[PDB]
């Protein structure tokens, strides 16, 4: 260190940019008293937020309902769990034509979950590992070399090396003893318990950083790419490679929420720039490893979970590489819907018992409330069930009136062999199982 | 089988259960696992009807068939879906049964002393619930995660005398005079 | 075969009680799904509770404002546009 | 939810019937049946064949 004490610099200013330092009043480009490795002001990566994120403001958004705009309360009633921000949020949603229509209040459980770095790291450290090309990490093994397995000269009396069968890792034609094979690389098991937290503490971070933008509809006039750059030009997004991109969680309109992206936008979202259409969700199914110990001795695979989070869910990497986040309300409906039963199960019991009083457990299956709004893909499945509940009328396995004789059924053990045979009106009905 | 209060057939021994209609229960946790279970049976029908929409023309040639082999879908409907309806129905009864009792309790109780105190006798209003539901009302604790912004502790963060700079491009720029940092020992 | 694959088609275009079709029985429960067209607006947006608005007049039983959309008419299937009229744009549109 | 109808249940192992299923000290569910119907021999059994069906 501190070597090269000379010759590293030219004693001459480049007649272009180079410039002396005038005085203390001189505002130097780039200078700032905090150690920032991404020195971005509000003109380079300008935040799409009502106010600039200030230490005073708990969050750079409408903490209150502003009077000159339709306010849309949350799809679901709201409760403030352990980590949430205890501060109301109101994010104005943007018309496609860059106008600001009605403002919408966000869920303080998904977008109110305050960040703490070491619990998004469990998300990032997962992505920076799950996103290797594991199968590329092959390497030749000692046995896999195809050389003579027999010492050509047995070392007896002269000064030859104590070596033979030179297919080991010392020689320039060898291979390792414990090499790196894919089936020896661990793909980490990632729980939904912490993927959800590790997604909510980011999509809040992208809200506290004021990079959160809600759009009514992410739809194009036509599926051509040019219409998607023209859309970005009106909305001001910077999908250039260098200008910070945009992360679209396409969920569809406010009234037509859908998981499968708007076919118009999907084909138009294929620009070479920096953008990544992710799926509108934060959960992912429980991990499982069917080849847990060694069961399948031929799998190529990594070790660990055999159900990795796909590449296009919302992760930590593509959440911090893309400055702005672009969520349609059709996703907010899905995120509040998919995390509702999760948000409720985490409240302490002396709270959980207060919900049906305050109107949180209105269960449309019992009919105490008309059914809430559903994803088009799920309402299309809900309507399927409502049409089918009549095919189960005459039978007995009807999954809506399970065991409808259990009233009049009378049981009677039989002392000849151990059984308990139910009778209904003296008539035996217990189906003696087949082995 | 049990799974509801009817008593499993293991009341072969004629074990009666007297002193009944005794408890008003709001079915809090059960309505939760109902909304969880009702989501599954709908999240299952969505799967049982997945039908090829191949947005690509490479393998478009199946765009009419279901996404599951006819024998499998004919199974998954019967193995997992129709199971999940029974599991949904079970909660749809353990609650519709418990309500029937509450409907009887909330009448015989409303009379005796007050129709005002009644829904207080049957309440669960813990003094802190303002912490979880309407946190704007809650003061008696400081339960923000960003505690240094609680109104009783806002006086921690400094209010910088900021300013804009049109010569720099409308950049906001704090007018604090930086304190000369420590340097040597 | 054009019968079995038809006798059973008609039973799914209409013969639902209601599932996105089912013009026979009544409105499916998801027709009455609580949709909030705007703060304080639910199914009509013309007055207040347009279904319940005509329930004020004698039209309680004969006026339905919910879009029981089984009854809705389906638009004609959209097909590929006609080829372009200028060879320059005629073959370039075959390069999209 | 996988058994649509009552598929008959076999009585537990003999060791269980000795200790729990039929033992009134635990109020086992057969402590009613055992005394009512089982513990009585056949109406024809003598002294040696009190255990044959």
């Amino acid at each position: 260190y501190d070597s090269r004490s000379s010759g590293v610099h030219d004693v001459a200013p480049r007649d272009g940019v180079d410039f002396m330092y005038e005085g203390p009043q001189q505002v130097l480009p780039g200078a700032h008293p905090l150690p920032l490795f991404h020195p971005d002001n509000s003109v380079t990566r300008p935040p799409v937020s009502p106010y600039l994120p200030s230490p005073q403001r708990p969050h750079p958004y409408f903490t209150t309902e502003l009077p000159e705009l339709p306010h849309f309360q949350t799809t679901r009633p709201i409760v403030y769990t352990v980590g949430t921000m205890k501060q109301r949020i109101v994010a104005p949603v943007f018309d496609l034509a860059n106008n600001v229509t009605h403002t919408r209040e966000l869920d303080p459980f998904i977008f109110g979950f305050y960040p703490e770095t070491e619990e998004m790291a469990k998300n990032l450290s997962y992505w920076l590992v799950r996103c290797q090309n594991f199968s590329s990490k092959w390497d030749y093994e000692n046995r896999e070399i195809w050389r003579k397995a027999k010492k050509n000269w047995p070392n007896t009396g002269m000064g030859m090396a104590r070596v033979g069968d030179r297919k080991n890792h010392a020689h320039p034609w060898g291979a390792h003893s414990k090499p790196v094979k894919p089936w020896n690389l661990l793909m980490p098991t990632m729980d939904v318990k912490t993927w959800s937290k590790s997604n909510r503490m980011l999509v809040t971070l992208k809200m506290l950083q004021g990079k959160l933008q809600i759009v009514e509809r992410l739809t194009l006039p036509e599926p051509t790419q040019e219409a998607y750059l023209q859309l970005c030009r009106t909305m001001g997004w910077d999908v250039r490679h260098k200008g910070g991109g945009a992360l679209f969680m396409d969920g569809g309109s406010r009234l037509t929420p859908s998981s499968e992206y708007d076919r118009a936008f999907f084909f138009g979202s294929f620009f070479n720039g920096r953008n990544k259409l992710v799926r509108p969700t934060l959960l992912c199914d429980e991990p499982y490893d069917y080849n847990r110990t060694s069961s399948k001795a031929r799998t190529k695979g990594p070790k660990g979970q055999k159900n990795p989070i796909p590449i296009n869910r919302f992760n930590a990497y593509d959440a911090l590489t893309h400055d702005t986040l672009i969520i349609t309300e059709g996703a907010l409906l899905q995120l509040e819907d998919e995390m509702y039963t999760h948000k409720l199960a985490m409240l302490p019991p002396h709270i959980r018992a207060q919900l049906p009083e305050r109107g949180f457990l209105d269960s449309e299956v019992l009919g105490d409330v008309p059914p809430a709004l559903q994803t088009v893909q799920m309402e299309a499945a809900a309507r399927t069930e409502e049409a089918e509940q009549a095919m189960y009328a005459p039978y007995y396995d009807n999954p809506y009136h399970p065991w409808q004789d259990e009233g009049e059924a009378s049981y009677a053990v039989d002392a000849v062999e151990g059984t308990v045979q139910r009778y209904i009106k003296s008539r035996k009905t217990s189906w003696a199982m087949l082995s | 089988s049990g799974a509801v209060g009817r008593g499993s057939f293991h009341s072969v021994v004629a074990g009666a259960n007297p002193r009944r209609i005794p408890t008003y229960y709001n079915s809090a946790y059960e309505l939760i696992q109902l909304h969880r279970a009702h989501r599954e049976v709908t999240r299952n029908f969505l799967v049982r009807d997945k039908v090829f929409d191949n947005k690509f023309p490479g393998c478009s040639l199946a765009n009419g068939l279901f996404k599951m082999v006819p024998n499998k879908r004919g199974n998954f409907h019967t193995r997992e879906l129709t199971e999940s309806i029974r599991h949904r129905t079970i909660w749809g009864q353990r609650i519709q049964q418990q309500r029937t009792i509450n409907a009887a309790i909330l009448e015989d109780a409303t009379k005796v002393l007050s129709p005002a105190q009644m829904e207080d006798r049957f309440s669960y209003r813990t003094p802190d619930a303002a912490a979880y539901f309407s946190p704007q009302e809650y003061t008696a604790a400081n339960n923000w995660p960003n505690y240094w912004q609680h109104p009783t502790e806002k006086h921690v963060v400094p209010k910088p005398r900021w300013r804009r700079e049109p010569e720099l491009g409308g950049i906001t720029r704090v007018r604090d005079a930086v304190a000369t940092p420590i340097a040597d020992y | 075969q054009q019968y079995m694959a038809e006798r059973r088609n008609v039973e799914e275009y209409y013969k639902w009680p209601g599932s996105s079709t089912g013009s026979a029985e009544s409105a499916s429960v998801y027709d009455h799904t609580v949709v909030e067209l705007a703060p304080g607006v639910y199914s009509g947006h013309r007055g207040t509770s347009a279904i319940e608005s005509n329930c004020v007049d004698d039209s309680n039983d004969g006026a339905h404002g919910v879009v029981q959309a089984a009854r809705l008419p389906v638009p004609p299937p959209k097909t590929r546009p006609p080829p372009p009229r200028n060879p320059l744009e005629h073959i370039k549109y075959q390069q999209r | 939810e996988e058994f649509p109808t009552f598929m008959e249940q076999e009585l537990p192992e003999r060791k269980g019937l000795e200790n729990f299923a039929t033992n009134s000290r635990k109020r086992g569910w057969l402590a009613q049946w055992y005394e009512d119907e089982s513990r009585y021999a056949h109406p024809g059994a003598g002294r040696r064949t009190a255990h044959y069906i």
């Binding site: 809506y400 009136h401 009233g407 009049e408 | 009817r6 519709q96 | 429960v29 | -």
Partner: peptide
């Protein structure tokens, strides 16, 4: 051995997917 307690209540529950009225 018949089931005296809650003898009914098997046929009175889970109105499957409440219809247009509710």
């Amino acid at each position: 051995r018949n089931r005296t307690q809650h003898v009914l209540d098997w046929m009175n529950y889970d109105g499957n997917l409440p219809t247009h009225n509710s």
